[PDB]
Amino acid sequence: GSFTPTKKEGRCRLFPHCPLGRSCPHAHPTKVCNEYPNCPKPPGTCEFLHPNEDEELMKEMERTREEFQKRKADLLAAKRKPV
């Protein structure tokens, strides 16, 4: 932990599982970084994605995407059949 009066260095913490992705004040990483691997941001502060540090974050994004795909597969398999 820590006891300093300092504010956040970037990056949202509930993400990808955050409901305010429209008006939330903290950075949702939804794009691959312009300057990776050369980035001065420590792991868990950059506005973008890094296919080495934030590689587990890309896995968490795929996890919620395949969950949402399974929810859409159930919708198209109701009053209708999959094909």
Residues contributing to the site for Zn ion (CB under 5 A)? 12, 18, 24, 33, 39, 41, 46, 48
CA dihedral 21, 26, 30, 34 (to 10 degrees): 150
CB of 42 to Zn ion, least distance (A): 10
Nearer to Zn ion, 44 or 77 (CB): 44
Q: Which is nearer to Zn ion, 24 or 77 (CB)?
A: 24
- Rounded to a whole number of angstroms, the minimum distance from the CB of residue 77 to Zn ion is 32
Helical segments of the chain, H only: 55-76
Burial (0-12, 13-18, 19+ Cβ within 10 Å), 10: middle
Q: Which lies closer to Zn ion via its Cβ, residue 12 or residue 57?
A: 12
